[PDB]
Amino acid sequence: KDKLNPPTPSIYLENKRDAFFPPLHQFCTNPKNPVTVIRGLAGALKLDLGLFSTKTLVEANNEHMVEVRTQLLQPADENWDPTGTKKIWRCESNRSHTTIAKYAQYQASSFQESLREENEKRKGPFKTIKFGTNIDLSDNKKWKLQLHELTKLPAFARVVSAGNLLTHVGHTILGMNTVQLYMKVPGSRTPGHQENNNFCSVNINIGPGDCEWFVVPEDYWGVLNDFCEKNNLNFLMSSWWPNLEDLYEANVPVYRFIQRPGDLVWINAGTVHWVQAVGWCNNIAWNVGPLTACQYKLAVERYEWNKLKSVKSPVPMVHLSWNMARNIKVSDPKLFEMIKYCLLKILKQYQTLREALVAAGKEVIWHGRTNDEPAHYCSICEVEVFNLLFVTNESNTQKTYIVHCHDCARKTSKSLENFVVLEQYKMEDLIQVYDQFTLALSLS
């Protein structure tokens, strides 16, 4: 079907009015639109993309760290096994580190070398390329002008905003509520994935070259998971590059489009995607969590799925949920009932655990909390741990407070005799937050 190669939801901006126009906000967050390409976004805002040029980055922080992925330069939209014999899903992507100055040097000489080849005139085997990924632009002192330029965006697409759930986490989640930079040469590939905890993603192409994007709606992610599992690949942890003929045969629709310099790509919640550089360019990206039932639901679902797959969730959805209930007036009936349900479950599980401890003669020690203290995770299994923290007798005495979850503490120490139980929140206070959390009226 042509329904298997659908058109890209695409908004064409001319000026600031178009960018700040509220139906643009609603369009991007509509669950029916897996991706929105906002064309001409930088131009409409007079964004200085030059602040993100390789030349400026070198001058700014030439020793800054870059995660290098070394890859094969693959043809078009395909991924071949190294012997050029068959198209496979697994892609080779070895990791090392470099600096902006060193990667910049390669980016520039790669282009000069391509110019000479174009002037030398005229299955693999395949050349090797390097992709500069995940460059951390969280330090406002090192990247003042860069980060300030992005406050010019409409609020819904900003790294920080009142309506961004990731703003409401209350602490830094690297690469999610902080900007990541990518420095690319032709063929630089970001393999298939969903965002961390299915949060939306915002990507701007700095240029000067284009990127090519591949997008599959969230509700087909199970199909791609089976493909991975049948191909001996971890959907969440392995590097894979879909066979478009496999997807077509399985009746999976694939959105496919070009992102030009200054185009902003909005990846909606849970949308599966992979990307390749067509030319030489940089990109900047971060996540955003719109206050919708769809975003919260997909975030919760991935959070729970990660536990089953023994994968850490970068977004602490328990911590977030209490912050939402404490600080956000929620007027969507569906969203409200989702949050209320989740808090009630947290609350009851917590009450059950606490009572089991008390009834077994285990003491619960009041530990309180520092405000804006990040969520905790289990030092062993990396699950989020909320309120009741399990700390060894020695870590307690040393006041290092190395957190464990209950299961891991119990597996270590059968009667928890090697652990103390630290309580960060009084129950009455949590019950109060829950009770005071009611549906706000909005006429919108």
Ligand SMILES: O=C(O)CC[C@@H](O)C(=O)O
């Ligand atoms: O630009 C890339 O290659 C990766 C970025 C993409 O995963 C995004 O979510 O913005």
Ligand SMILES: [Mn+2]
């Ligand atoms: Mn992404």
Ligand SMILES: [Zn+2]
């Ligand atoms: Zn654990």
